[PDB]
């Protein structure tokens, strides 16, 4: 029972979601190989993802993690880029959205850097690119990102399935690229809510 409400760009909500998308762009060590070459996005549409069953699935698990961690759910707003975004907004996150070949295990991956999530919009390493031009740096086709409410709880810090014992998620602390932001991994689909569906294009630097 998913409903997508279009957010007006006049709305304070559109303005704060676009600002978290824009300000969290960074240069990638692959030179744009996976996500393309760009410094900003053309934000075409921001939509609120409304689903009573999934929101309840998430706040139920949130209350569990909170009570297991001195009433702190450790809730973040993170980006999620995946070829299975359209399936996530209707069925939620689960074991089919888990990244088997992940660095922090077979869990569901999230990023603080929007530009990081953009690397997985067309698949692992950007796949073959957009389905129309087979271009990983395509500047034409419309891309789609999720801005998710994530319950991290007790997160296992990793400097560089199931969660480490006595923990609720894993934090990928960046230990080489001094400008990278953290990456997070949850092992329960219930621990995340697909809050915002952002439609956009990467923009050719001038
Ligand atoms: C680091 C990071 C940030 C981000 O936004 N997204 C992701 N992924 C990881 C890989 N994914 C995946 C899911 C299910 C599969 F079958 C294969 C891949 C989805 C998106 N990673
Ligand atoms: Zn294209």
Swiss-Prot record:
Modification(s) after translation: Ubiquitinated at 'Lys-48' and 'Lys-63' by RNF146 when auto-poly-ADP-ribosylated; this leads to degradation. Deubiquitinated by USP25; leading to stabilization.
Subcellular location: Cytoplasm; Golgi apparatus membrane; Nucleus; Chromosome, Telomere
Tissue: Highly expressed in placenta, skeletal muscle, liver, brain, kidney, heart, thymus, spinal cord, lung, peripheral blood leukocytes, pancreas, lymph nodes, spleen, prostate, testis, ovary, small intestine, colon, mammary gland, breast and breast carcinoma, and in common-type meningioma. Highly expressed in fetal liver, heart and brain.
Domain PARP catalytic: 8-206
Annotated Zn(2+) binding sites: 130, 133, 138, 141
Assembly information from the UniProt record: Oligomerizes and associates with TNKS. Interacts with the cytoplasmic domain of LNPEP/Otase in SLC2A4/GLUT4-vesicles. Binds to the N-terminus of Grb14 and TRF1 with its ankyrin repeat region. Interacts with HIF1AN. Interacts with RNF146; this interaction leads to ubiquitination and proteasomal degradation. Interacts with NUMA1.
Family under the similarity heading: Belongs to the ARTD/PARP family.
Function, in words: Poly-ADP-ribosyltransferase involved in various processes such as Wnt signaling pathway, telomere length and vesicle trafficking. Acts as an activator of the Wnt signaling pathway by mediating poly-ADP-ribosylation of AXIN1 and AXIN2, 2 key components of the beta-catenin destruction complex: poly-ADP-ribosylated target proteins are recognized by RNF146, which mediates their ubiquitination and subsequent degradation. Also mediates poly-ADP-ribosylation of BLZF1 and CASC3, followed by recruitment of RNF146 and subsequent ubiquitination.
Protein name from the UniProt record: Poly [ADP-ribose] polymerase tankyrase-2
Annotated organism of origin: Homo sapiens (Human)
This protein's encoding gene: TNKS2
Full protein stretch here: 952 to 1161 of 1166
């Amino acid at each position: 029972g998913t409903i997508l409400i279009d957010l007006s760009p006049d709305d304070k909500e559109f303005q704060s979601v676009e600002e978290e998308m824009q300000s969290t762009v960074r240069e990638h060590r692959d030179g744009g190989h996976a996500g393309g070459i760009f410094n900003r996005y053309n934000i075409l549409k921001i939509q609120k993802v409304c689903n009573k069953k999934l929101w309840e699935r998430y706040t139920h698990r949130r209350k569990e993690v909170s009570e297991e961690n001195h009433n702190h759910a450790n809730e973040r707003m993170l980006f999620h880029g995946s070829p299975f975004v359209n399936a996530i907004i209707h069925k939620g996150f689960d074991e089919r959205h888990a990244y088997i070949g992940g660095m922090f295990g077979a869990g569901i991956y999230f990023a603080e850097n929007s530009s990081k999530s953009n690397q997985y919009v067309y698949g692992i390493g950007g796949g073959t690119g957009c389905p129309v031009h087979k271009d990983r740096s395509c500047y034409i086709c419309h891309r789609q990102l999720l801005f998710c409410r994530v319950t991290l709880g007790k997160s296992f810090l990793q400097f560089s399935a199931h969660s480490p014992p006595g923990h609720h998620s894993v934090t990928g602390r960046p230990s080489v690229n001094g400008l990278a932001l953290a990456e997070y991994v949850i092992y329960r689909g219930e621990q995340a809510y697909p809050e915002y569906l952002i439609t956009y294009q990467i923009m050719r630097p001038e």
